């Protein structure tokens, strides 16, 4: 099976790419596996595959860390992402995000039901598993539980059967047959949960699939529109119908090659302690436990020699940056264009801990709008900050065509030099805020409201007559012939490769 | 003579350090020398010494570019700065800035007058030089003139003789015997100029010395207090009285080993076209010429085989970042401490184009103040933004003790995660603004007023009971024994030197 359509094949692909370290000696899921993974993510090293995990029994489970993290080389920096999508390993961020957006104006390709698949190779009923006996990792030393769920896909369906959502949301083990996790507005798992709670008749049928098709985990991490079934979006993006099998204990459908599948229910009534967790913004607040959603597990099915993917998230750079930030930015780019705003590109700079998105403006189009900064900033912020795609983003930075928004250094330069604090910004206090940012949930103001800003780093003549500067840099402050002469004579004179 | 006390010795020191490229083939001062220098600064390469400059006659002049720019290696990143100060080449920024501040609570060591020195080896009178015939560089393709003065020291004295100021301010050639340059408030050359204009009797006696003692050019670039003669500050810092010679045509005193000395007057009445220039924030606005101060040159003296230092300034990283930003930050650190504010460290992040300063707070002291963010932000901004040392800085970022302000990535992390936009900031519109920032002089608001902000990245409990998080990073989210085990087994497992 292709790497983008089968997690097991994806692991092989990383091995082929010389982007895997297999560790075949015993590794402790109590902090050690996550510590190694953390170090990998902070140094852009090879992904670790822990084949000998202390506590693994009857095939449950190996761990793959850092499945969507960065490579060291500039040339194939995003190669692990590209391998989720059948793209060349040298693909640019622009190419990855365009691939992820491509299905937005295609007919869905609904999934194909097949009678069985590798995820049915082994099974454990209600009398045969205990989630406290599995080698679930403790990811950070102060976490409030063992976070089994950092890179699986929750599957829930609207009561009327018309929308089946796939998404990543964290969950930890509560007891032998329950998890607790984050289910918060405006996320689709929360929207669907609310539908079932209003109906009031039963708990939400649920499955959680780990080690799903890489293309599916990418869409699981992207805020595609309300009501859109991820399976058919992935089908369109990949050009192939995804093969799904029915769950044994409910009528949901899981990817045929899922490594591990939990089947059960998401309660419409019960909660349990959840967190704290070492989160995407780089912090844990020890002791900060709150009530989260509660899931009951009725059945486990799994592949022979099942592999659990794991995100050891926190400070730069991991899946919470490369996927959450980048995929939100992609959706925001499209949202702006569909609202007739002249945005060509969007990216969440890693330097901002993916709390900013830089929006590259087609300033020829802007000039034809005959508008002003105050009006344009307000328009952009109203579109983005009143939409789910803008949920995680607290600062939008508007930049002109000379800035490559995929280059943090250039975004920081433009922000620092072209946006006058205060005067060139509009604050938004009556929008939904993202409470997981420390300055929100642990800050001086309401955890759930406000704290957002549009920072205009367009210069005044970009609205009127056109850019009126040249950069004081090698590229723009010297003529072409001279630049080439300097380059051609560089090593000859005594001064200092692409792939590396 | 020691490298920190003699520019010629400093050049040798860079050669010894394997931090010099000597170019002995012809190089054009029309853009080529500056283009090579620009490339050096954007890639942290070795400093270039242009020994064969097209247009050099009768010993005027060679050029040294990038005299205060960065080295490639992390271990000796600031080695060129350290060589200005007799510090080891591996000195930290903290050590360099502490050296620059050390004289602030020492008795000055006034300069020693000596009858002659190398700067008197050659001379050209009023009939023998023409500044348009010298190989003055065109530094950026759109500059409004040939900027002879990018790394020399202006010398002016108060009318009452009690204060002699040394400072760097740019100047370009106007005609055969005049320069024009920037003389703007609140700079000391402007303050002294104003004194002479109020007296109304004569033009300001002036000298401009190029290739001065490296320790002297560092102080020339630092906002030491009003009324303080730089020569005696440098004397105290170095522990040695600087040797000065009298000018031939006036009674000012120049460093004995100056490479090149111009003697003349700064007009109290005349102006001439000045700029535009490729400036520290990374831009040139072509055609943006304004009237600047006008200097008349009466005499030139110079060393045999004189060397002109040159800053090819603009985008990161050059002397306008490493010296202007860092030395302002140093002075701001001291200013805050003298105003009883609990600041331990200050640095201007390069990522901010040195428009921000990050202030590291001793939060034990902060807690004993029993204050709030709004009160503390206001206090800090009133001290810094109403003082000359704060002139160039538009954003102050307050951070707690866990942040190393000398590490841009950590400053950006703290800013992005701990400071709620709006609520955690105080804007200052009734303070002097720095017009050279594009969003000031070429922006939407008054060029000379406002546009400043204090951004509080202290978390709420840092004011009360203490830090209440741990970082979700390798260092803080894993116990020491485990971290060491991971490190000790890192290469054994298959994963990836200080000097590099
Ligand atoms: C990549 C990724 C995405 C996580 C995530 C993580 C990763 C690695 C973890 C598991 C390591 C840390 C926490 N996660 C959460 C999460 N969204 C959320 O609502 N709760 C979460 O707990 N997300 C973001 C979520 O997947 C996106 O917001 C999707 O757009 C949600 O899908 P939806 O649009 O269908 O609701
Ligand atoms: C290192 C450095 C500092 C420049 C400088 C440059 C460099 C390389 C140039 C020459 C390349 C670009 C422009 N420069 C100017 C300048 N200050 C100023 O008032 N006008 C300027 O034109 N400065 C900053 C100035 O030296 C500091 O603000 C000092 O504190 C001024 O000394 P003072 O406190 O005695 O007034
Ligand atoms: O645990 C985290 O780091 C998290 C999260 C999250 C929640 C909602 C949307 C995006 C990320
Ligand atoms: O020409 C420049 O880049 C400049 C400047 C300057 C002026 C005043 C204070 C600091 C720097
Ligand atoms: K999704
Ligand atoms: K602006
Ligand atoms: K000075
Ligand atoms: K704060
Ligand atoms: Mn969805
Ligand atoms: Mn001074």
Helix (H) or strand (E) holding B399: strand B395-399
- A133's CB contacts (< 8 A; 6+ apart) are A55, A57, A176
Question: Nearest Cβ partner of B477 from A141, A423, A486?
Answer: A141
Q: State whether residue A18 sits within 8 Å of chain B by CB.
A: no
**Yes or no, beta carbons of A31 and B474 under 8 Å apart:** no
- Measured from the Cβ of residue A379, the count of other Cβ atoms closer than 10 Å reads 18
Q: Please check whether residue B359 is in contact with residue B406, taking contact to mean a CB–CB distance below 8 angstroms.
A: no
**Nearest by Cα to B65 from B87, B91, B45, B90:** B45
Residue pair A423/B444 in contact by the 8 Å Cβ criterion: yes
Tracing tokens 């943090």 back to the chain, one arrives at: A408
Interface of B with A in 41-70 (CB under 8 A): 42-43, 45-46, 48
Query: Are the beta carbons of B141 and A470 separated by less than 8 Å?
Result: yes
Closest CA to B79 of B94, B64, B96: B96
For residue A276, cis peptide bond before it (omega within 30 degrees of 0): yes
Quote the CA–CA distance of B299 and B104 in Å, as a whole number: 35
Chain A, 258-317: which have a CB under 8 Å from a chain B CB?
Answer: 278-279, 281-286, 313-316
The answer to whether the Cβ–Cβ distance between A482 and B32 falls below 8 Å is yes
Spatial CB neighbours of B463, under 8 Å, sequence gap ≥ 6 = B366, B367, B371, B372, B373, B376
Determine which helix (DSSP H) or strand (DSSP E) holds A300, and give its type and residue range.
strand A290-302
3-state secondary structure of B270: strand
Query: Of all atoms in ligand 1, which is nearest to the CA of residue A183?
Result: 19
Q: How far is CA B441 from CA A351, A454, B433, in A?
A: 28, 21, 9
CA distance A30 to A141: 9
Q: Are residues B470 and A284, on separate chains, in Cβ contact within 8 Å?
A: yes
- CB of A295 closer than 8 Å to CB of A231: no
Whether a cis peptide bond, with omega within 30° of 0, leads into A186 is: yes
Q: Cα separation of A313 and A316, whole Å?
A: 8
- Which H or E run includes B381? helix B373-385
Using a CB-CB cut-off of 8 Å, the residues of chain B touching A66 are none
Binning chain A into helix, strand and coil, the percentages to the nearest 5 are 30, 25, 45
Q: Which ranges in B178-325 belong to alpha helices (H)?
A: 188-199, 214-220, 230-238, 319
Q: Considering only alpha carbons, which residue of chain B is nearest residue A317?
A: B473
In degrees, rounded to 5, the angle at the alpha carbon of residue B100 between the alpha carbons of residues B99 and B104 is 100
Answer whether A18's CB lies under 8 Å from A295's CB.
no
Distance A74 CA to ligand 1 centre (A): 27
Please report where in the chains the tokens 């229910």 appear, as a residue. A265
Cα B101 to Cα B106: distance, rounded to the nearest angstrom: 10
Helix (H) or strand (E) holding A471: strand A470-471
Is B92 part of any known ligand binding site?
no
Q: What φ, ψ does residue B57 adopt, rounded to 5°?
A: -140, 140
By Cβ distance, the residue of A45, A313, A420 closest to B445 is: A420
Q: Three-state SS for A440?
A: helix
Report how far residue A99's alpha carbon sits from residue A4's, in angstroms, rounded to the nearest whole number: 13
B163 is known to lie in a ligand binding site? no
Angle of helix B326-338 relative to helix B373-385, nearest 10 degrees, comes to 120
Task: Compute the distance between CA of residue B311 and CA of residue B306 in angstroms, rounded to an integer.
Answer: 17
Among residues A185, A169, A392, A391, the alpha carbon closest in space to that of A281 is found at A392
Q: Which of A31, A284, A478 sits opposite B141 (nearest CB)?
A: A478
Task: Give the tokens for residue B6.
Answer: 């003699």
* Angle in degrees, CA A285, A286, A290, rounded to 5: 80
Tokens of A202: 């039963």
Q: In angstroms, how far is CA B467 from the centroid of its own chain?
A: 35
- Reported as type and span, the H/E element at residue A377 is helix A373-385
Take residue B205 and report the two structure tokens written for it: 């006696």
Rounded distance, CA A168 to CA A478, Å?
49
A447 touches chain B (CB under 8 A): no
Q: Strand, helix or coil at A449? A: strand
Q: Is residue B214 classed exposed, middle or buried when 0-12, 13-18 and 19+ CB atoms within 10 A define those classes?
A: buried
Question: Resolution in angstroms, to 1 decimal, for this deposition?
Answer: 1.3
Report whether A117 contacts A35 (CB < 8 A): no
Question: Cβ(B358)–Cβ(B406) under 8 Å?
Answer: no
Structure token digits, residue A478: 């010297």
Six token digits for residue B461: 């409990």
Give the closest residue to A149 by CA, choosing from A194, A97, A209, A102.
A209
Which parts of B433-474 are beta strand (E)? Answer: 452-456, 470-471
CA within 13 Å, CB half, B444: 21
**Cis amide prior to B276 (ω within 30 degrees):** yes
Neighbours of A285 (CB within 10 A): 20
**CB pair distance less than 8 Å for B314 and A471:** yes
Sign, CA dihedral B403-B404-B406-B408, equals negative
Comparing CA positions, the residue from A352, A148, A279 lying closest to residue B469 is: A279
Helix B93-101 / helix B326-338 crossing angle, nearest 10 deg? 60
Closest ligand to A374 CA? Answer: 6
Q: B447 touching A, CB under 8 A?
A: no
**Which ligand 4 atom is at minimum distance from the Cα of B182?**
7
B14 vs B17, B71, B209, CA distance in Å?
A: 5, 11, 21
Q: Which residues, 6+ apart, have CB-to-CB distance to A200 below 8 Å?
A: A268
Bridge partners (DSSP) listed for residue A48:
A21
- Please compute, for residue A27, the number of CA atoms within 13 A of its CA located in the half-sphere on the CB side: 29
How many Å apart are CA A70 and CA A46, to the nearest integer? 9
Q: By C-alpha distance, which of A392, A389, A465, A380 is closest to A424?
A: A380
CA B393 to the chain's CA centroid: 13
Instruction: Please pick, among B279, B319, B331, B425, the residue that the annotation labels catalytic.
Output: B279
Contact (CB, 8 A) for B4 and B214: yes
Is residue A279 annotated as a catalytic residue, yes or no?
A: yes
Q: Which of A274, A279, A425, A462 is catalytic?
A: A279
Identify any residues that bridge with A470 across adjacent strands, giving them in sequence order.
B284
* Contacting residues of B for A35, CB less than 8 Å apart: 474, 478, 482-483, 486
């Amino acid at each position: 099976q292709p790497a983008h359509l089968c997690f097991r094949s994806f692991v092989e692909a990383l091995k082929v790419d010389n982007d895997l370290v297999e560790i075949n000696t015993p590794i402790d899921p109590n902090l050690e596996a996550a510590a190694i993974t953390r170090r990998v993510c902070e140094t852009n090293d090879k992904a670790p595959l822990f084949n000998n995990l202390i506590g693994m029994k009857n095939g449950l489970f190996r761990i793959l860390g850092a499945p969507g993290s960065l490579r060291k080389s500039s040339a194939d920096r995003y190669g692990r992402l590209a391998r989720h999508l059948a793209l060349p390993p040298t693909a640019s961020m622009r190419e990855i995000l365009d691939k992820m957006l491509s299905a937005s104006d295609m007919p869905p390709i609904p999934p194909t039901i097949v009678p069985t698949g590798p995820c049915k190779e082994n099974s454990l009923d209600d009398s045969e598993f205990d989630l406290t006996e599995l080698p679930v990792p403790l990811i950070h030393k102060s976490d409030g539980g063992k976070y089994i769920q950092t890179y699986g896909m929750h599957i829930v369906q609207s009561p009327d059967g018309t929308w089946t959502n796939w998404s990543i949301a964290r969950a930890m083990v509560h007891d032998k047959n329950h998890l607790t996790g984050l289910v918060i507005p405006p996320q689709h798992i929360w929207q669907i949960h609310q539908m079932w709670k209003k109906e009031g008749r039963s708990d939400v049928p649920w499955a959680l699939a780990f080690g799903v098709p890489p293309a599916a985990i990418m869409a699981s991490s992207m805020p595609i529109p309300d009501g859109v079934t991820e399976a058919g979006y992935v089908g369109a993006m990949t050009g192939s119908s995804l093969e799904l099998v029915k769950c044994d204990t409910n009528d949901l459908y899981v990817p045929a090659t899922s490594e591990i599948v939990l089947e059960g229910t998401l309660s419409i009534s019960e909660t349990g302690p959840e967190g704290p967790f070492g989160e995407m913004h780089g912090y844990i607040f020890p002791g900060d436990t709150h009530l989260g959603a509660k899931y009951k597990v009725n059945r486990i099915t799994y592949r022979n020699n099942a592999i659990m993917p794991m995100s050891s998230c926190g400070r730069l750079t991991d899946e919470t940056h490369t996927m959450i930030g980048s995929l939100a930015a992609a959706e925001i780019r499209k949202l702006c264009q569909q609202n007739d705003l002249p945005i060509t590109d969007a990216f969440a700079p890693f330097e901002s801990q993916v709390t900013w998105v830089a929006l590259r403006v087609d300033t020829e189009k802007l000039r034809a709008m005959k508008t002003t900064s105050e009006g344009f900033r307000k328009r952009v912020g109203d579109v983005v900050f009143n939409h789910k795609a803008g949920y995680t983003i607290h600062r939008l930075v508007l930049v002109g065509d000379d800035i490559d928004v995929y280059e943090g250094k250039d975004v920081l330069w433009a922000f620092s030099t072209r946006c006058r604090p205060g005067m060139d910004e509009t604050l938004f206090e009556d929008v939904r805020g993202f409470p997981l940012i420390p300055y929100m949930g642990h800050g001086n103001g309401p955890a759930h409201r406000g704290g957002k800003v549009v920072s205009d780093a367009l210069m005044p003549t970009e609205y009127t007559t056109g850019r009126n500067w040249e950069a004081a840099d090698f590229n723009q402050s010297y003529p072409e012939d001279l630049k080439q002469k300097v380059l051609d004579n560089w090593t000859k004179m005594g001064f200092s490769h692409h792939h590396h």
